[PDB]
Design a protein around this ligand. Sequence first.
Ligand SMILES: [K+]
Ligand SMILES: [K+]
Ligand SMILES: [K+]
Ligand SMILES: [K+]
Ligand SMILES: [K+]
Ligand SMILES: [Mg+2]
Ligand SMILES: [Mg+2]
Ligand SMILES: [Mg+2]
Ligand SMILES: [Mg+2]
Ligand SMILES: [Mg+2]
Ligand SMILES: [Mg+2]
Ligand SMILES: [Mg+2]
Ligand SMILES: [Mg+2]
Ligand SMILES: [Mg+2]
Ligand SMILES: [Mg+2]
Ligand SMILES: [Mg+2]
Ligand SMILES: [Mg+2]
Ligand SMILES: [Mg+2]
Ligand SMILES: [Mg+2]
Ligand SMILES: [Mg+2]
Ligand SMILES: [Mg+2]
Ligand code: NA
Lengths: 118, 72, 226, 255
Amino acid sequence: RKSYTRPQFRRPHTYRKPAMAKPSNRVTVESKDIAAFNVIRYPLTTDKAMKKIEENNTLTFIVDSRANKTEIKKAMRKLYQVKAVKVNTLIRPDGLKKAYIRLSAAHDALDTANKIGL
Amino acid sequence: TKALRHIDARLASRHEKSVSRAYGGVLSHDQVRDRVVRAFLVEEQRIVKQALKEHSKMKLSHKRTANKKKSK
Amino acid sequence: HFAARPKNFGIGQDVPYARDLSRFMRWPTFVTMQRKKRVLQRRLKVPPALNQFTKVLDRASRNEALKLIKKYAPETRKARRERLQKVAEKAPLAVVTGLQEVTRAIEKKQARMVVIANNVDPVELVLWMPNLCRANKIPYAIVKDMARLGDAIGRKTATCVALTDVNAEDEATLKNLIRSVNARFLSRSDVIRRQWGGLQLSLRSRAELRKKHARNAGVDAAAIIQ
Amino acid sequence: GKTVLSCRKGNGSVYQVHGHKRLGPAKLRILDYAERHGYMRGVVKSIEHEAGRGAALARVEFRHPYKFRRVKELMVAPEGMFTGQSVFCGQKAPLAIGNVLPLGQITEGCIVCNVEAKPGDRGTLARASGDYCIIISHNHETGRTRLKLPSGQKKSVPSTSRAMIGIISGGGRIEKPVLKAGNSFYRFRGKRNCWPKVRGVARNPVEHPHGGGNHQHIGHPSTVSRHSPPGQKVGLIAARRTGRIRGGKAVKGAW
RNA sequence: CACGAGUUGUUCGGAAACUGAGCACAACGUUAUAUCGUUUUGUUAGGAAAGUGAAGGAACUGAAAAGGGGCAACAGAGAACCUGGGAUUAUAUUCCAAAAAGAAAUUGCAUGUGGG
RNA sequence: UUACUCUCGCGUUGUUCGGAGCGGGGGCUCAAGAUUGAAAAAUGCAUUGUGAGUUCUGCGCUAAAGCAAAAACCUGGGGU
RNA sequence: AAUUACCGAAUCUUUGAACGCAAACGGCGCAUGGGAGAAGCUCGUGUCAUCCCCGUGCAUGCCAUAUUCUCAGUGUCGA
RNA sequence: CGUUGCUUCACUUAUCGAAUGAAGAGACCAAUGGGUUGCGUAGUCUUCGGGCUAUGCACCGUCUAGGUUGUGGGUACCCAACCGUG
Ligand SMILES: [K+]
Ligand SMILES: [K+]
Ligand SMILES: [K+]
Ligand SMILES: [K+]
Ligand SMILES: [K+]
Ligand SMILES: [Mg+2]
Ligand SMILES: [Mg+2]
Ligand SMILES: [Mg+2]
Ligand SMILES: [Mg+2]
Ligand SMILES: [Mg+2]
Ligand SMILES: [Mg+2]
Ligand SMILES: [Mg+2]
Ligand SMILES: [Mg+2]
Ligand SMILES: [Mg+2]
Ligand SMILES: [Mg+2]
Ligand SMILES: [Mg+2]
Ligand SMILES: [Mg+2]
Ligand SMILES: [Mg+2]
Ligand SMILES: [Mg+2]
Ligand SMILES: [Mg+2]
Ligand SMILES: [Mg+2]
Ligand code: NA
């Protein structure tokens, strides 16, 4: 018979077949190129926002409140072909999310603002 | 040995928290000496006792054979 | 340079090897219960009706009977389908299997020999069959393990098997088997009906009683006159 | 009426043990193969005080009999035990203060403490500070031993039960008067919520059988039956006698 | 009262990620009825609750180790950043851009150089 | 190290310490400070000397009351 | 038809019996399939470590089943 | 002779108490045991195959610590029997 060296019995080790991957239960059509439009909603044109454009090379936008800083950087590159070196975010008292996006020195925030239409 | 906090202890060199002597950083110099002497003397007493017991048995069996040869 | 370095395994001393702990470990509940049930069944007092199933047939006779049963085993599904197709374009002689059909054969007195497994649970399924066979004066044997009967006939288990007809090539074998079976079971009816069972002490209790008797020996010698 | 305080204490609630500072239960070693056949040697490492207990506790270190590790035990310390002392436990241990021996191996007339009522119980008798038990006699035919308990009663136990040689440390505690209410406050802080005490005749009839009246008095005898229901069994419960004891004092307890 | 604005962090507080007085999911038991009880004195449950180190020829396969899964502290434990500003109407140890006004510390992953 | 031989010596405001090693000479190490510089003048505004207060820190750590735990981290004993 | 009425095709955020783990946290996992990637590698391309985003499965109990999956028992046999 | 009421002595399998991470129980030292998964004697039955009741011999079925009988490297047994019990 088998020999046991511990004072209590534990469950033996047996073969386990891994689970299989089922067909996906979601069949709605989603597009990869549409995603960036959801992240960035629209820019702001308040007095504080306008001062930052000329003096800090910074833009101001209203973004999706569930987005993070990393995604906002990627969307900015994909929509306006500019590089952002720093993103600061806050959630306004009215529930919306605002982002101060500082552009790299290679680009001019004022030039980008004119292309957008501010 | 220095007195260092959590982050300071992790980044410091190994010399600052130990000593080249055996049990360095755990026991003091006098405690190491006590253990070294104790290990030698206690072990030696066991050897003396062990050899004493075997010879007493050894000399006892020789007498039995001598008594056996005398009778026979 | 090689030398021997023996280890001291006395009380205290060096750390010992891992010794077998099977007899003292905590087993699962079903293991413990299936051992305690056998112990209790041995310890209690068993009525004759249950006790008769403990005394079984001899190994050689059991092997011969199982060989004959396997020789006369029933047909399989493929064989039956092939035979039915051939006749389309009665089953051969075989043993009788199944509780209902075996009981009918015994009651109608068509069977020449009956074999009964000794480990059927619930036991009420076959507890009366030896009595029925004795009343009808039919040779019967009680053998070990329904699994062996099931293997002989081609299934997983079987409670009882009846032999009714056998060819001339095995008539003599059947007669010898009937003689042996009658010697073991049918001739000893009075003993079977009167004999009780159980009441077995354990090895520890038996040894304790023996040592007690040995110790308390001769202490009453002085009370004997002369 | 309303529930009496003695019955209310049985629910638990705010009347349980204050055990946050305690070090754990104090017990002997486990009765194992080494203790049954040979002996084990351990070293006393520290002697400490526990809140709520008058006796000192000792930490004793042994080697594990089956594995490469150390085992630490917490025991009630007999008087005279010191740090660095060697302690022997088992069948073959010598007779000295602090060792643990089976009762059948201890000479009649000896003083013991931490006595096992049943074999393997790890010590249940003679544990309070300054207490001890006395060995009276052995019975080899029955394999039993007779003991005199601190209360004065006599008890028979199997000779396989273990005991420690000596008396419990910390004796003489109750000889010093307390003198202050604050000292009692601190004394019971480590034990439980049972102080101060309010007299029954100072309560109202709704709460206690002794309450009420235009004078503070009990209107009925204060000796009550053994069969009284809870809430009625207050006072002197099933008393055989009352009043000041004249002559020798009898031994308390049941037959 | 009306209109228009304002809260910016690798290092600040929390969480990720500690344990305490304590709570009670699973498990078992009880109840006509779970919407009841047990659940830290090293610790669940008559109780088979461990799913991967190395290996071995690149994914597999299985040794070891007793006591299931959680929550409970914005004053306990833990925690890598400081000053200057002419930088707001309202924020800042959170903003400042090539002379970053500047000076640091720390985590993850990669590339040389040196040693082994 | 005939240091305590016959009133032994060192030390605190203070309740004490020494052949189980005082005091003196020479050293090793830890903690808290001081000093020299880099930062740093390029900043800020338009100087370096004593007394009093001040819990960081040091002076090692009443009681029948003797003052939480764990994560995380550090060092060692073996082995490679 | 930015009209109405009805209905067969569709969309359907966070939760809730709520069921991966928790919760005065828009928090944290394992497996698998994708996406984007200003590092590095390579000939504006391709490829991509750490980090980041998305879909699907993963509670407990019970029933059936395994082209007949892997095991345990001083339970009963057998060779 | 039979059955049934109480009782006292021995036992252990129901049950109760305690401990432990269910961590070393009992025997081998031998029956007032077990075995068809054996051999005889005397009775007594038999469905003639063989059983039952007493009684003997085999088999299950064996081991052992300890006790008695000038510096370096080595030797100093085996008996067999009783005691003892891991
Ligand atoms: K069974
Ligand atoms: K109180
Ligand atoms: K009254
Ligand atoms: K009154
Ligand atoms: K088996
Ligand atoms: Mg923020
Ligand atoms: Mg408690
Ligand atoms: Mg009143
Ligand atoms: Mg009343
Ligand atoms: Mg009065
Ligand atoms: Mg009354
Ligand atoms: Mg208003
Ligand atoms: Mg407004
Ligand atoms: Mg409890
Ligand atoms: Mg707790
Ligand atoms: Mg738990
Ligand atoms: Mg804090
Ligand atoms: Mg922080
Ligand atoms: Mg303000
Ligand atoms: Mg002197
Ligand atoms: Mg959920
Ligand atoms: Na405690």
